[PDB]
Design a protein around this motif. Structure first.
Motif, mmCIF file in Angstrom:
data_model
loop_
_atom_site.group_PDB
_atom_site.id
_atom_site.type_symbol
_atom_site.label_atom_id
_atom_site.label_comp_id
_atom_site.label_asym_id
_atom_site.label_seq_id
_atom_site.Cartn_x
_atom_site.Cartn_y
_atom_site.Cartn_z
ATOM 1 N N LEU B 3 0.810 -1.210 0.000
ATOM 2 C CA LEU B 3 0.000 0.000 0.000
ATOM 3 C C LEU B 3 0.851 1.271 0.000
ATOM 4 N N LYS B 4 0.249 2.360 -0.494
ATOM 5 C CA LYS B 4 0.925 3.641 -0.673
ATOM 6 C C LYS B 4 0.255 4.729 0.163
ATOM 7 N N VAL B 5 1.060 5.470 0.937
ATOM 8 C CA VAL B 5 0.606 6.646 1.679
ATOM 9 C C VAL B 5 1.269 7.880 1.087
ATOM 10 N N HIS B 19 2.737 -3.523 7.164
ATOM 11 C CA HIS B 19 1.411 -3.926 7.622
ATOM 12 C C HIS B 19 1.134 -5.393 7.345
ATOM 13 N N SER B 22 1.320 -7.453 10.243
ATOM 14 C CA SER B 22 0.313 -7.140 11.246
ATOM 15 C C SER B 22 -0.488 -8.378 11.616
ATOM 16 N N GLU B 30 -14.567 -4.065 5.986
ATOM 17 C CA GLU B 30 -14.656 -3.511 4.639
ATOM 18 C C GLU B 30 -15.852 -2.584 4.472
ATOM 19 N N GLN B 387 -0.515 14.385 5.982
ATOM 20 C CA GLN B 387 0.172 13.111 5.807
ATOM 21 C C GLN B 387 -0.842 11.985 5.952
ATOM 22 N N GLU B 388 -1.044 11.226 4.881
ATOM 23 C CA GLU B 388 -1.830 10.008 4.996
ATOM 24 C C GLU B 388 -1.063 9.005 5.854
ATOM 25 N N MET B 389 -1.791 8.260 6.680
ATOM 26 C CA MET B 389 -1.193 7.298 7.594
ATOM 27 C C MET B 389 -2.004 6.016 7.539
ATOM 28 N N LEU B 390 -1.304 4.880 7.554
ATOM 29 C CA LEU B 390 -1.928 3.573 7.684
ATOM 30 C C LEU B 390 -1.828 3.124 9.137
ATOM 31 N N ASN B 391 -2.963 2.727 9.702
ATOM 32 C CA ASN B 391 -3.021 2.251 11.073
ATOM 33 C C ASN B 391 -3.219 0.742 11.065
ATOM 34 N N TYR B 392 -2.481 0.057 11.947
ATOM 35 C CA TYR B 392 -2.535 -1.388 12.063
ATOM 36 C C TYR B 392 -1.771 -1.781 13.329
#
Ligand code: HEM
Ligand code: HEM
Ligand SMILES: N=C(Nc1ccc(CCNCc2cccc(NC(=N)c3cncs3)c2)cc1)c1cncs1
Ligand SMILES: N=C(Nc1ccc(CCNCc2cccc(NC(=N)c3cncs3)c2)cc1)c1cncs1
Ligand SMILES: C[C@H](O)[C@H](O)[C@H]1CNc2nc(N)[nH]c(=O)c2N1
Ligand SMILES: C[C@H](O)[C@H](O)[C@H]1CNc2nc(N)[nH]c(=O)c2N1
Ligand SMILES: [Zn+2]
Lengths: 412, 412
Positions: B3-5, B19, B22, B30, B387-392
């Motif tokens: 994935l891309k942030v 991730h 994770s 979803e 800033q886009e962030m991925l949470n996991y």
């Protein structure tokens, strides 16, 4: 399957069952939350009828005639029309319902307490760019209403094959130009530098200044788009002054009164409306915080802090924060003193909590995007900071779409 | 699956593959994003060994001996110890690694650029509440370091059966009391009114004032908890003054220097550490915005706005915003002038972007919770807003746990 959202400032608890009717997907999985990604992720006759039926079952349910005679005949009528044309046409009432609920369903919009007071303009008889200009001009005039702004949407013909699309290439009907410079700097609005140049390519004669209202690029029935200048008398603008600092006039800033988003797509009952410009009014922070103070926008924190005589040497003097508050006091004051409609982030976020209570009560929920609902300054001193929100996609809806210049089979 | 942030202020793009490692779940599906819910959601020997193996495979990988002799023997050694006792003991090095990576992995913490400079205090030989007091006193002294604060964690014995747990019942080692009133108002800190009263029940003699440092309630090996007063010489406090407004002293506010969270649970290799108080230093907004200006906290916007002579009649004068900025200038100034460590939201959020770049480069990602990373004021004028962030959820980790007084099989 019957989820609970809590407010941690009031200890108020609400129960969401509306998300069960959710259809589209969010981007999140059980192992990754994407709630801070800015943009997450032809149409056949097979897929079309369930979407039509789903929409018509909630339309007729809404007017208290679910399953009645008129419902079943309308269901069969649309089914028969999707057999013959592999598409169909909304009744005027269905079009107004659809639009209002797309807004109602917009989880990123803090204004939604107004969602039912929306003026719907049916432009589905339009066939040329000149007709689009005319419809768009009448939208601006009506919505602005001498500063006493009124929400409205204008809906151009639905997509059909795909290569015959109505598009407005502007991001907003009213938007300031952006031009770069020899020294690589930028005059006007850096957001629109590509679009400003596109208008120059199709033939715009730019007055290369700060607050130059862009022309409209209007594409009708898939043809190449065409430039039109909104008459300046319809373009209401507000000169920004401060109620204390008189050097603020010397800053010589101004903004337009009418925020009117034009690049989004409206889905109703499986039908796609590629040109559906919609307008309401501004929350003050959109101008004073983002437009004026984003680093990649007008970026004026530098100059306002200078004229306030601030300690700009250090990060920790909070001079940026101090000049940000003055700037938003100025936007609000200037709009109000002129009787041009505007709402401050405190009033708007309070109304959204009240709206949330209404939706959970009489609808079982209210999809909401915390990342977008919380305003870009003074976050925790607004009640929405402390409000848990469930986000989910309900239809009818407003969707993003590519810019027409990246997809249009160009024709020169 | 790769994935891309994106950062929408710098157009910088990062690729997250971390991730994939994770394990735990987020609460999102979803069809529903729960990224704004505050708290989302015995241990058998069957489940224990995979958790041990997973931890040991990344520990040994980290010291560049993945799969070597020592790894396989340690894997077999722990397996054999989990056969005999259905649990196991971490080596001192494994305990320090685990703790530092629980912090590294804390997606809600903007401070994480320091994650490897952490002082780990092994309190696993502790057996009594008096020993806990002693260990906690030495933690405070060391971490405070005369104002030149140092990050540290003290780790008490791991949970075993479950009914023998070490717990610190305070939320933070240093925390101001809260008492209600006859007229239903509240003196001190309304956050802790229940805990303040609990100490009174177990026997505290309260000095019913504003900024009264609570005693420690310490529970060892499942026994009933016991009250202890931190020696005042170890409790560093900062009187809040303003660099312009001299009436600000008359406000007579103050805060403690050392933020030290004590009610969380540390998971390492499937082992649970129910008492693991950890301390760093403050980002200014935690005190000036949340502690001082939350409506359900000290709630001082009223008085500061009054003494600034502000137009408090209207919402839209932004008097709340204006007095919020002054208050945070005051917190920062007072802490700095005293040589007590503190970071302002601008410096801390910038460092977190820099930290993010490091993690994506040398680790393939950095789990991050936008709702918590963005500071509670001046959101969009900090780089993390954009800033886009991925949470996991990655492990080792810090988890929430119930308050001991709701679960402890009380004994009177
Ligand atoms: C009447 C007053 C209104 C107010 C005060 C308001 C306020 C806002 C604000 C502050 C945002 C965030 C925009 C941004 O930060 O870029 C937003 C988003 C949005 N608004 Fe509302 N709005 C209003 C009316 C409307 C109307 C009339 C519609 C549709 C007919 C609408 C649909 C939307 C949509 C779809 C978004 C999401 C746009 C996106 O995802 O980029 N709004 N609104
Ligand atoms: C050294 C300077 C540090 C700074 C500036 C910092 C900053 C912050 C801030 C502002 C928050 C949000 C807290 C809130 O709003 O309630 C937070 C959360 C958190 N911090 Fe850091 N922190 C630091 C050190 C540490 C250390 C040393 C640890 C662990 C050993 C840690 C672990 C955490 C955790 C687990 C959370 C999440 C707490 C929750 O979910 O409620 N932090 N941090
Ligand atoms: N180019 C960039 N990407 C980018 C991509 C997508 C977007 C989406 C921006 N939605 C603009 C918008 C949408 C809805 C309401 C309003 N406002 C109103 N009040 C109303 C308007 N009509 C009735 S109410 C404004 C914005 C930016 C960026 C560069 N730097 C930071 S973003
Ligand atoms: N009672 C309520 N619930 C509630 C439930 C959970 C929570 C969790 C609050 N985490 C406190 C915290 C956690 C981590 C870091 C810091 N700070 C630091 N810098 C450091 C401390 N140690 C090293 S760094 C502070 C907070 C509130 C509420 C009522 N109104 C609004 S919330
Ligand atoms: C990276 C992040 O998602 C991006 O900045 C979002 C954050 N929240 C926002 N909220 C609003 N209202 N408008 C925005 O443009 C954004 N941008
Ligand atoms: C409802 C909402 O999730 C709640 O206010 C969260 C929002 N973000 C936060 N962010 C931080 N750092 N600390 C908090 O306590 C909260 N509270
Ligand atoms: Zn999510």
């Amino acid at each position: 399957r019957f989820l609970k959202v809590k407010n941690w400032e009031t200890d108020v608890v609400l129960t969401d069952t509306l998300h069960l009717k959710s259809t589209l997907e969010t981007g999140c999985t059980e192992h990754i939350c994407m709630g801070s990604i800015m943009l997450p992720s032809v149409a056949t006759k097979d897929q079309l009828f369930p979407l039509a039926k789903e929409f018509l079952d909630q339309y007729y349910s809404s007017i208290k005639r679910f399953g009645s005679k008129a419902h079943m005949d309308r269901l069969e009528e649309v089914n028969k029309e999707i057999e013959s044309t592999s598409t169909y046409q909304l009744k005027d009432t269905e079009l107004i319902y659809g639009a209002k609920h797309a807004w109602r369903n917009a989880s990123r919009c803090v204004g939604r307490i107004q969602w039912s007071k929306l003026q719907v303009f049916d432009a589905r008889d339009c066939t040329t760019a000149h007709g689009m200009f005319n419809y768009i001009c009448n939208h601006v005039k009506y919505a602005t209403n001498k500063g006493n702004l009124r929400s409205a949407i204008t809906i151009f013909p639905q997509r059909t094959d795909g290569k015959h699309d109505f598009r407005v290439w502007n991001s907003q009907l009213i938007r300031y130009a952006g031009y770069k410079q020899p020294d690589g700097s930028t005059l006007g609005d850096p957001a629109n530098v590509q679009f400003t140049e596109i208008c120059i390519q199709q033939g715009w004669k730019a007055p290369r200044g700060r607050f130059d209202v862009l022309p409209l690029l209007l594409q009708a029935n898939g043809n190449d788009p065409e430039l039109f200048q909104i008459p300046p008398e319809l373009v209401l603008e507000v000169p920004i002054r401060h109620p204390k600092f008189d050097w603020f006039k010397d800053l010589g800033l101004k903004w337009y009164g009418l925020p009117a988003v034009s690049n989004m797509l409206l889905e109703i009952g499986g039908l796609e409306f590629s040109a559906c410009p919609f307008s309401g009014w501004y929350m003050g922070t959109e101008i004073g915080v983002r437009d004026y103070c984003d680093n990649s926008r007008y970026n004026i924190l530098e100059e306002v802090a200078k004229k306030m005589d601030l300690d700009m040497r250090k990060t920790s003097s909070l001079w940026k924060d101090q000049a940000l508050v003055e700037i938003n006091i100025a936007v609000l004051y200037s709009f109000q003193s002129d009787k041009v409609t505007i709402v401050d982030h405190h009033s708007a976020t309070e109304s959204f909590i009240k709206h949330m209570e209404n939706e959970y009560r009489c609808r079982g929920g209210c999809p909401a995007d915390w990342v977008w609902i919380v305003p870009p300054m003074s976050g925790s001193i607004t009640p929405v900071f402390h409000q848990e929100m469930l986000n989910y996609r309900l239809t009818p809806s407003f969707e993003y779409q590519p810019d027409p210049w990246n997809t249009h089979v160009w024709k020169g």
